[PDB]
Amino acid sequence: PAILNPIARPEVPQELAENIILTSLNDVYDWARLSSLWPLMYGTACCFIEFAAMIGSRFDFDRFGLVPRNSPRQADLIITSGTITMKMAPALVRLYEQMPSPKYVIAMGACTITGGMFSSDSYSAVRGVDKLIPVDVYLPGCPPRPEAIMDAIVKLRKKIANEHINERGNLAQTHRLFTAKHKMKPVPPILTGQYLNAPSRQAPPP
Amino acid sequence: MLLKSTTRHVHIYAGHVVDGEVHPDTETLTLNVDPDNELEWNEAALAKVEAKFRELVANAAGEDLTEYNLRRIGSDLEHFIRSLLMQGEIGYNLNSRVRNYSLGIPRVNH
Amino acid sequence: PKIETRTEPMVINMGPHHPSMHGVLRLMVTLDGEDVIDCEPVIGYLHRGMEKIAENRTNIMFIPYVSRWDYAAGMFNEAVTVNAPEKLAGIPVPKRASYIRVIMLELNRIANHLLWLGPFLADVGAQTPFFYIFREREYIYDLFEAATGMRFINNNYFRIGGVAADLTYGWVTKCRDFCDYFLPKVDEYERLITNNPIFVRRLQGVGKISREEAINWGLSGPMLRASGVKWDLRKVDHYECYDDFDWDVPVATEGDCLARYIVRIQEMRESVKIIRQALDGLPGGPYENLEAKRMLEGAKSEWNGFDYQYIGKKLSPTFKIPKGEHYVRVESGKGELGIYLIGDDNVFPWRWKIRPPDFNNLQVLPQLLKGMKVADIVAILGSIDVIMGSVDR
Amino acid sequence: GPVGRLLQSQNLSVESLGRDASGVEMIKVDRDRLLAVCQTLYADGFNYLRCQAAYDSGPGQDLVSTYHLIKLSDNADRPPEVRIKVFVPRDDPRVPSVYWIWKTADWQERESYDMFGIVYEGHPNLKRILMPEDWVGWPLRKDYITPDFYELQEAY
Amino acid sequence: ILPGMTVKVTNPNDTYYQFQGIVQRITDGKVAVLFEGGNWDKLVTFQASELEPVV
Amino acid sequence: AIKKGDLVKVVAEKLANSLEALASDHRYPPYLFEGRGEVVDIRGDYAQIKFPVPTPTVWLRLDQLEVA
Amino acid sequence: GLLAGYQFVKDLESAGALALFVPPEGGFEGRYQRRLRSKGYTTLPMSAPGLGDLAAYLTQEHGIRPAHTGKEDIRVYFQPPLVTYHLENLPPNAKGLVLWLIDGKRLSKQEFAYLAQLTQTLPKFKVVVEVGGDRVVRWEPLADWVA
Amino acid sequence: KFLNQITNYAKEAVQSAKYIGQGLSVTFDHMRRRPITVQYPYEKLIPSERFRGRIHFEFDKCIACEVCVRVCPINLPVVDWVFNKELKKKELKHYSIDFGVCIFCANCVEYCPTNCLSVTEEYELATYDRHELNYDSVAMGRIPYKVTQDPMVTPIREFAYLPAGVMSGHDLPAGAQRAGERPEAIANTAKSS
């Protein structure tokens, strides 16, 4: 109750290394994971259309090594592109977590870092993706100039270089987990096929 | 199939983790408080979170097993964690990772 | 590790994470041996609450929301949200601001058809036209960024009494240069496609609705006009500055993907025919000559009258839209956008509604998949110009 | 009005609200004989809907199901463009479905149901397209109290 | 040049050629011209040598 | 009497037994009774209430309120 | 260059405030930040386009007023200083607290001079500023580059 | 019956080969046309005279009208005033905009009477944290960037600022102007015959 939301004052600090033959190899490691970030084609709204224009030929992002990839597993980056409603959010955590561990995030737009215009009087928007996953770089602006995304990638590339190779302990999950028996009466799934084969579509009632 | 509530630093499921799988059982309700290490946990405050979860499932739940309800539980836990993190029991990790203040910046309580 | 085959129809999920542009959309589809019986399309992944946000937001406060329904063309809906309270108050609109409205809005139609065309071909094979449209559709971005501030979407260039801001100096002859540069290139596309067999053999006769079967399901846009129906609200409703131009409303009759493609690609030429015919008829011409002729003598002359101004009386944020309900509509690329507005007496509306064309057009996804294939789905889904942002209401 | 005097001769009467600032007329077709009026109009070449969703007349009085109708002749001039309104009580009741007379009512009525609580007696796939199907609350009513979800609060 | 003083631009190698605008702020030799015109007021930093203190 | 500076507090009980609470969910927000309900509109007999959390307004009536 | 030792750390410990003229790609500067972290220094970049007087955010205690959106009428938070709080939240064996600023072009001469003078006072504290530019990563004392 | 089938077969084959070679020649023609790519960090693009980037702010011209909040779609800008008692003046004590929330509709800029609140051509906003985007009164003026005055940039004009007939903006003379005359020149031309 003196400094709210405080910092924790760690001990046993980091035990970094200092030899040159390892830190040059660390520079190569970071340069390699750096200059070949492979995004995930994750589109939800006009931020994706600006990302599509970023793919284009007025200014690509194929240079400094970015290949738009379709699956998470091969990917390295979610340029979060659009609004995250409360019905697609687990379909974003299940894309982020379902991905290899040295992975990064960019949050383009204002509808996905505070909810933007939908940060008020909306009842189905997530007011910030930073309360779903660890955002690594923020860039503002509903539709931002897609060359601003390349500013964000510059700013992300000078953060991949800010990493170290004997520091990958801050890259896993601890899984502080529990269990609890309950009683909440499971219901059947009402979400199946049966859109035209249902009896009520082929049946004017009496 | 699973019915989960995946916010940040609260992930709730409806199965039993055997070694890393989940195996939905319809009655175990696991939890995975703060996997990404946004916060630095003690032995006491974490037990308070555990007890909040236990007396929030059993004490008030007698209706269906929708994701709506688990999402509501996750919201109550993510507000309880604000309370613990404001009062000053736990704090941010400070490590050389992201350091994005999802919950809040530090105040002084004037 | 394996899956235990059985003699039953297979259910597969084409989830939110499409590897494409056609919004985020589920299609829980059930198939009988690389066929399709039906599918439950679980849309809803992009409901953020427009129709209840539009009740604590006055007109000028809400108009930037409006351009997020059709992410491709954010002026077919700014125009409608303008026209809705504009009719109740009976605010006269000039010919200049309405010709500007026509020009910019039809230019957005061009953009919309291009953004339909790109992923329509990417899902149907090669990616090169996706790169050839953002080589070309990127010029109207610069046009808009000159006239309005931002590019595709978020312009918020339109206002109730007309248009917010008069044009820039060198906009008109440059739009003419674009108009002249475009027609040689809609032909280069037809050199690269429209006869390539590996393309046209992919979508010969997939999808079809009859005339009257496309009217129960109300497929208001080109889908309704790609089945033998001469009907467009630019002509039958006498939208603002029309009957002053030449017209050739395209129609096909096959009802299939060719009947949509040919209609869209002829529309994206008829649109240029409108634009070239509008620039030669402004009340004032280019803003350069207009402002010069005003300042030369016309501190009182007829080149400063109401019909030559870009707006009537500029309004406050307390316009206080009057009472009385009505339904406005506009024929966009996907089809008929519509707004059922009511109003009580105050700045905040009462039941703002959106009637998007994509919603009704996307109703009939499964009928078009009444036993076709698993791999000719995207060819059909890419035909409507589905923008899931236009299904948030 | 013209449509009013027309279907008055078809032996079923409905109120008249006048016109709505565009030449369109409005009639309060009642709940029970709604399908009969709709079938007479579809017989008299009203084959296209153009909107269906609803509005709330206020917090306590009653709901509405505002339809809209049109003749839709090919290559036409300004058509008649009528609509009809169905006041329904608040707590329990509902309306019938017009899906079988003419379509466009499937997902439109499904979302009106989703956002206002208007059941549609005789509607297939009467589910929630928006608003995850496990949801509860009937959002767009004037009296709706949202939950205290964590992803709805702030970027505090 | 000093604040509050309207100016214009004399630089054919600049898109803001021959626009009149009011100076807003001056720091470290570069002056922020404010182009009251159109609808949205625009603000841009020009060097003192690109300008011409019109009356 | 309800005038110029005083905020409101939904009470507990006149809300969910009077045939008009059936829209929203049975259980209630943990921001239930905190006296922050700022004065925004009254339509003769109706009330409109903010609830200062960016999640939309609500239209209530006489029986459901107290002034703190 | 293609390989560099720790002379950057010596230059920084000597001058107190350097100014990087890295290229506009942001790929060949974080390694020097690593070389600093490989010694015991701890970093905090906080993106100068967003810093104010730079005497209220670094030395003194200032008032941040968050975004109200019609809801939650105006309120302050009073976050503590950025340089007397992280400097006290160091580990035990901490050599100092370096300070990185990504976009330095947007700032002015006065606060460059202020950050330079602030290295001597408040001892365990150093500064670096990424003023974009040259096609080879070279640096210069920040007391220089001004006057 | 059978020979005609083989002839139609060969005809389909030849037409397919021809329509493939057509696109072949097209793509082989596109690989001499100059790239329209904009090599951004070294070849940045110049924004227009109406682009809406970062908001500006002066502290001396504000009079605390609260129009900025009453007009923003979401009531964003945090005006804070105290009303000193000399006669009536509202004293402006603090002013901020969270650019992680701002939408860049610039209605704020549009309705500020004092010409205090303007748009800048800064589109290069980004942080590692969103509590740094909350720009203060002394961090909103801050004298924007001006792309051209950058020693390591080759600026490019966009399609509305290129000479008539010109389409790209890469290899241009050093005296190019937009399309046509300004109205001042037209007026002084008509006045002088």
Ligand code: SF4
């Ligand atoms: S931030 Fe802007 S561009 Fe991105 S989704 Fe929201 S409205 Fe669209």
Ligand code: SF4
């Ligand atoms: S609109 Fe202008 S004068 Fe009014 S509060 Fe904002 S900055 Fe100050």
Ligand code: SF4
């Ligand atoms: S740009 Fe729009 S959202 Fe931002 S401060 Fe101005 S009016 Fe408000």
